[PDB]
Amino acid sequence: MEGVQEILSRAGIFQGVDPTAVNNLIQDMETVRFPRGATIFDEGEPGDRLYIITSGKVKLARHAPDGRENLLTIMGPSDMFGELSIFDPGPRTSSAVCVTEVHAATMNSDMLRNWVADHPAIAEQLLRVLARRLRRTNASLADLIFTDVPGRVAKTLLQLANRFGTQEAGALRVNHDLTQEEIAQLVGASRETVNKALATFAHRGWIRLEGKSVLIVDTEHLARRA
Amino acid sequence: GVQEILSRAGIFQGVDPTAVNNLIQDMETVRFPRGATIFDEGEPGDRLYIITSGKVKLARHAPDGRENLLTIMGPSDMFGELSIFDPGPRTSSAVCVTEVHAATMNSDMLRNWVADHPAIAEQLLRVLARRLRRTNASLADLIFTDVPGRVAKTLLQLANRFLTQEEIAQLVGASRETVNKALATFAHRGWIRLEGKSVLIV
């Protein structure tokens, strides 16, 4: 249906790819839905399925023997996950759990081989997608090593707003729905450290802290801090 | 053998060996003096380098203008590799520790290289994924593993072949007040040895 296939076409994997080929793969894709709280996969599990959300929220968490788990990200419409599986079938690098009911469409490595075979020119476009992904994954590594807590709070707030923000009267209302601990986990620091940084941010007039939402009043200043 | 050194490149792991050689013969060789910057953070980038001899440090600009060292690389290492699939501004500086010799290609060569060997396209998507696989593996550990464990990781990774005091602790991620006390404990167990910018591993 138009809107659902509109949502799908927006995914990273299709960004800057041949529009006709994108249409082609979209109609070959299988739909799935999952209920609220459903587990899609567990970290460690073998996989060969890439998911593109068309509706609802999935969280990806990282785990450990000691130092249990850590929210990695939260994802919504047009986002994809599990993409590694279809390029390098192997074990899942995270967990994926449904925060709400979720509707998605999926593919596996075969559908991908067939796809490229049909539209060879897209291999170059998909390498660009795979590299853009890399650019981002190394960045989060660098930030975690070198940026300070306030800085990474600033980053995390901006990243959530890019993905889940509402333009509101010159500001951006971010409706993440996360505990203080989860924000800490995204930032990679302690509930306490992260909460101070937030408070200093409010005190500066850059943000207003309201329930489980953040109103970013001063993007420029907050960004410069990031 | 420059070819062999070049053949040990991550970009080439598990790709058609004839497709690999065809490109090697056709890559440009380049040389830089000691100290020279190859590229600066934020300049338009479009070139992959593979080191054939010498050492290159990669770093990002820090606040207060300070220095943030991301990695040291020697023969067979490649930097700028992402600019070749996804042009645009460089995300680090690459600076020559010694005199440097290296081979290069641009995205313009890479387009022609796939169009000549469509077999590779999939092998190249696998490479990137494997690298992607590796970086998260690094991220998990970083949020989880102890600085000693991460100083042990940096030590083992650089030891492939056998940086100041405030440069190793950048690689590792935490304080030099932590990285050093991690390093001393290792030496007390008799694992490694001081000597200056030099370390001996057992």
Curated annotation (Swiss-Prot), chain B:
Stored CDD domains: CAP_ED
Annotated ranges, domain HTH crp-type: 145-202
SUPFAM superfamilies, A to Z: cAMP-binding domain-like, Winged helix' DNA-binding domain
One Gene Ontology CC term in the entry: protein-DNA complex
GO biological process terms held by the UniProt record: regulation of DNA-templated transcription; regulation of glyoxylate cycle
GO molecular function, one term: DNA-binding transcription repressor activity
Keyword Ribosomal protein (UniProt): no
Induction: Seems to repress its own expression.
Keywords of this entry: Activator, cAMP, cAMP-binding, DNA-binding, Kinase, Nucleotide-binding, Repressor, Transcription, Transcription regulation, Transferase
Amino acids binding 3',5'-cyclic AMP 1: 65-71, 80-83, 90-91, 135-136
List of residues binding 3',5'-cyclic AMP 2: 143-144, 166-176
DNA-binding region as annotated in the record: 165-184
Assembly: Homodimer.
Physiological role: Global transcriptional regulator that complexes with cAMP and binds to specific DNA promoter sites, causing DNA-bending, to regulate transcription. cAMP improves binding to specific DNA sequences, probably by altering protein conformation. Involved in the regulation of gntP and gntK genes, which are involved in gluconate metabolism. May form dimers which bind to the aceB promoter region in the presence of cAMP and repress the glyoxylate bypass genes.
Protein name, per record: CRP-like cAMP-activated global transcriptional regulator
